[PDB]
Structure 1
Amino acid sequence: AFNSWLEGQNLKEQVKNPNIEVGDYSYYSGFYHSKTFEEQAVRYLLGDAPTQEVWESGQFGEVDKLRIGKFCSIASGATFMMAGNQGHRADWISTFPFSKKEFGEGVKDGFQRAGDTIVGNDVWIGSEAMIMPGVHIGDGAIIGARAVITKNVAPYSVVVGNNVVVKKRFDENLIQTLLVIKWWDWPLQHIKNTMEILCSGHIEELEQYFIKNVG
């Protein structure tokens, strides 16, 4: 797994679940939680080891998948909760998932999909954070450690605690310029050339390089 906490495992090369969509360079640094990204960070997703056979038989059908963009930093212990409500329905008299074996016919399947969990590009997710099912995280967003995300996260927003939005990393205009140029989609050599600008707050410099050289 991880020999040290200075280690960062590339995700697109490793993940095998046909329901986890990762981008380039995105990594999971989970040394202090031992297990890999697919058996510790992604939870209750059909198409894994302990669940592979059940997924290949096609018993449950289509699933909610996890999509992660490029240049994402996923810290140790971060958790992506899938499988939606897992059969529990608060609007029903009972939240207990009765089984047809023990309780016969008339058992209505309470499961209902919550939608795909989508993580944008250049997203930093803090250690031991937890994402709820069906949550969209915009590009450039930052998730604090031990945060519990229940709602969609605006791009370049910073969210702490139990879905407390602190601030946006930049002015709204500059945020929209970054959302238009999309440096993460650039060819590698352009990113290598503009790395000095990327290691800075000078957004409009990056925009000028984009207009002159990329777009």
Structure 2
Amino acid sequence: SNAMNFFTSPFSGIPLDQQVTNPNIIVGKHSYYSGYYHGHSFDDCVRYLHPERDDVDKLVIGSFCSIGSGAVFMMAGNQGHRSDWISTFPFFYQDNDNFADARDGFTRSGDTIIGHDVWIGTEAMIMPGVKIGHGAIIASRSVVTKDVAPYEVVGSNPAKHIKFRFSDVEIAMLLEMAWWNWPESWLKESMQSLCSSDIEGLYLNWQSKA
């Protein structure tokens, strides 16, 4: 058949919970990664995450997330580089008798936590320990060095505030609704509402039901 069968969708992709093999990566349902233009699966988007240790920083990703091609998740902390020390060269991790009495410069940064309904643009890099709130949008080629508020749009290198998707009242409504945790039958009933800007109307409907 056509050469289109070789390609993958720009609007869709392989779900995360159908390709992740690293046990230190927690992913929610329906979250996918469309990485045709970088070959490797999502496991290789996560850099230097030890898959056999339980005392390392973890990568947690919510549900209904969209991750563009070539996204990078740094998961090794400072990688043994102490800027406050005299040298950033990791003497502790070079097998050399002259470096025997070096101190370990590795420092954890905490878990990298991606919320629900997060849109991560293509080739965006997420620094270790970064928390990204629900509904946030990471622009393409962004370098996220700080936390991102829920439903906040950020971009540039380093990532800085661009705008909020909705007003504070609407954001509060979505955070209380938490449609990502609704039963599958509720999403099927509210597909037309979820594909619109009418947050206040859906919030009033959700109040009567629950």
TM-score, structure 2 normalization: 0.92
Does residue 174 of the first structure (1) align with residue 170 of the second (2)?
Answer: yes
Deviation at 1:3, TM superposition (A): 3.4
Deviation at 1:63, TM superposition (A): 0.5
What does 1:113-132 correspond to in 2, within 5 Å? 113-132=108-127
* 8 Å Cα contact 1:3/1:31 also seen in 2: no
Cα RMSD between the aligned structures? 1.4
CA distance in 1, matches of 2:105, 2:134: 33
* 8 Å Cα contact 1:126/1:144 also seen in 2: yes
CA distance in 2, matches of 1:3, 1:186: 35
Per the alignment, residue 144 of structure 1 pairs with 139
CA distance in 2, matches of 1:104, 1:153: 40
* 8 Å Cα contact 2:14/2:34 also seen in 1: yes
Deviations, residues 155-175 of structure 1 (Å, cap 9, x unaligned): 000001121211000011110
CA distance in 2, matches of 1:3, 1:124: 25
CA distance in 2, matches of 1:110, 1:15: 30
CA distance in 1, matches of 2:49, 2:156: 25
Q: Secondary structure at the match of 1:111?
A: coil
Q: Secondary structure at the match of 1:80?
A: strand
Q: Unmatched 5+ residue regions in structure 1?
A: 48-54
What does 1:185-200 correspond to in 2, within 5 Å? 185-200=181-196
Residues 129 and 100 of structure 1: CA distance in aligned 2, closer, same or farther (over 3 Å): closer
Per the alignment, residue 52 of structure 1 pairs with none
What does 1:107-118 correspond to in 2, within 5 Å? 107-118=102-113
Deviations, residues 9-36 of structure 1 (Å, cap 9, x unaligned): 1111221211000001000000000010
Moved more, 195-204 or 2-11: 2-11
* 8 Å Cα contact 2:19/2:41 also seen in 1: no
TM-score, structure 1 normalization: 0.90
* 8 Å Cα contact 1:74/1:124 also seen in 2: yes
Query: Identity of aligned pairs, percent?
Result: 55
Per the alignment, residue 46 of structure 2 pairs with 42
* 8 Å Cα contact 1:100/1:107 also seen in 2: no
Q: Unmatched 5+ residue regions in structure 2?
A: none
Q: Which residue of 19, 24, 35 corresponds with 2:24?
A: 19
Does residue 5 of the first structure (1) align with residue 8 of the second (2)?
Answer: yes
* 8 Å Cα contact 1:24/1:70 also seen in 2: yes
Deviation at 1:4, TM superposition (A): 1.4
Deviation at 1:208, TM superposition (A): 1.9
Pairs aligned (count): 201
Deviation at 1:96, TM superposition (A): 0.3
Deviation at 1:106, TM superposition (A): 1.2
Q: Secondary structure at the match of 2:163?
A: strand
Q: Secondary structure at the match of 1:196?
A: helix
